[PDB]
Ligand binder design. Structure first.
Ligand SMILES: CN(C)c1ccc(C(=O)NC[C@H]2N[C@H](CO)[C@@H](O)[C@@H]2O)cc1
Ligand code: NA
Length: 434
């Protein structure tokens, strides 16, 4: 597997949440999420990553006019993450194109929404709005499948350029997820993904690279089908940056039976297997790129939920993938219920992990009171390997075999270690002090 890297050349293992669904329809475009909420998340789970929802409607409220005050608000939030050592992926988020389709959809500004008078009648489930005539036409106009709106993708790319211009020198921002859950309207499958989808990604990457050379550009397959374990027809995107390509692949995982026991468990288990095979293939097509599982999630009060969650994180670990759980929002899907009570997610996610490794992590494992990590060394890296250790399992000092302890911060829960770079692969084992 390939990894995103920090400025010290360390390989990043990314663990966190999508924050937050509540932003989708917020008038000011911000999630209902405070600095105190992040402090709680960090204290309870030691996360180091966020997929932070932004929106085109908030960036570009009028054609060619970008809202710098909105970007100020996003910058303020990124600051909260920066202060607690997080890396941030900005997600240009949409579901069902736009709020202007009827509160149901979100993403595009009203000026960018052309349903051409075609109907969008009320449906019993939100997902069904995707296939209503007016929504299908909004998407068809966006992709210029209709031939009537070539400007829309160009506007999209330049709104991204505006965002990248603001965040190019932000040390907490590591990735730009170019489009949440792409949907092709009347185009579906490889016709969509290798056609207008790939074309938009190339134009947007190119525009971003006018103002930002170093942030990872993250691309997704179409959501419908591929979310459920079908192959993607997405094709390679060219990164014009001088040096090595910085493109990453950011698919989602949503097995059909969950939308976890008996035949339903078997179906979900083979879905993961299929999803892994397909994800690995497309990551190869894109240039042996790093993988971020940008969304997965379920109602944690469902029987078998913990087994499913643990299986997904083990699979991500084996794949060398980042994870942003959908989502931090209050409710039984999330880490907290609305009254602040912890769900099953907190104890499940609160495990030791390597955050930033001085070399390529070839294999690792962790339990409540043990972490083991094997590193393929890189002599050029001078920064230590940085590891999260939860207090429940590590209430005092650490015992470390295979590395020298550089620092052990019992407040931030960050252990830093140093390993030789001239003795082949090194295995570090961390346990609680006697
Ligand atoms: C019919 N189409 C095109 C469709 C249907 C359903 C989803 C979906 O459930 N996606 C999973 C989650 N992703 C969003 C956030 O990106 C969440 O609201 C969904 O639960 C996607 C597309
Ligand atoms: Na950055």
């Amino acid at each position: 597997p390939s990894y995103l890297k920090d400025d010290d050349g360390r390989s990043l293992i990314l663990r966190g949440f999508n924050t937050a669904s509540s932003a989708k329809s917020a008038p000011d475009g911000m999630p209902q999420f405070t600095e105190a909420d992040l402090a709680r998340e960090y204290a309870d789970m030691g996360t180091n990553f966020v997929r932070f929802l932004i929106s085109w409607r908030s960036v570009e409220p009028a054609p060619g006019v970008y809202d710098q005050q909105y970007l100020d608000r996003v910058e303020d939030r990124v600051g909260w993450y920066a202060e607690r050592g997080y890396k941030v992926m900005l997600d240009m988020h949409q579901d069902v194109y736009s709020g202007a389709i009827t509160a149901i959809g979100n993403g595009a500004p009203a000026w960018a929404t052309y349903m051409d008078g075609l109907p969008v009648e009320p449906q019993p489930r939100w997902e069904l709005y995707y296939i209503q005539p007016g929504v299908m036409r909004a998407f068809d106009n966006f992709w210029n499948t209709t031939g009537k709106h070539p400007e829309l993708v160009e506007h999209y790319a330049k709104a991204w350029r505006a965002v990248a211009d603001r965040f190019a020198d932000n040390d907490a921002v590591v990735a730009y997820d170019l489009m949440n859950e792409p949907f092709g309207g009347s185009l579906q499958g490889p016709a969509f993904e290798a056609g207008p989808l790939a074309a938009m990604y190339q134009r947007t990457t190119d525009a971003i690279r006018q103002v930002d050379q170093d942030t990872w550009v993250c691309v997704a397959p179409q959501a419908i089908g591929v979310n459920q374990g079908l192959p993607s027809g997405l094709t390679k995107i060219d990164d014009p940056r001088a040096g090595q390509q910085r493109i990453a692949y950011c698919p989602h995982l949503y097995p059909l039976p969950l939308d976890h026991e008996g035949l339903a468990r078997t179906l979900t288990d083979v879905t993961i297997d299929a999803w892994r095979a397909n994800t690995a293939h497309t990551a190869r097509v894109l240039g042996d790129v790093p993988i971020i599982l940008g969304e997965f999630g379920l109602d944690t009060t469902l029987p078998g939920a913990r087994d499913y969650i643990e299986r997904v994180y083990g699979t991500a670990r084996e794949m060398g993938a980042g994870v942003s759980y959908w989502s931090s929002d209050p409710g039984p899907w999330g880490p907290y219920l609305p009254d602040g009570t912890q769900t099953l997610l907190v104890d499940t996610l609160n495990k030791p992990y390597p955050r930033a490794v001085a070399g390529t992590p070839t294999e690792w494992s962790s339990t409540s009171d043990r972490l083991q990590l094997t590193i393929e060394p890189d002599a050029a890296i001078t920064a230590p390997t940085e590891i999260y250790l939860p207090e429940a399992g590590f209430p005092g000092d650490v015992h470390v075999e295979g590395a020298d302890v550089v620092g052990w911060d019992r407040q931030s829960r960050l252990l830093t270690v140093r390993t030789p770079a001239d003795s082949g692969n090194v295995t570090v084992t961390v346990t609680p002090a006697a």
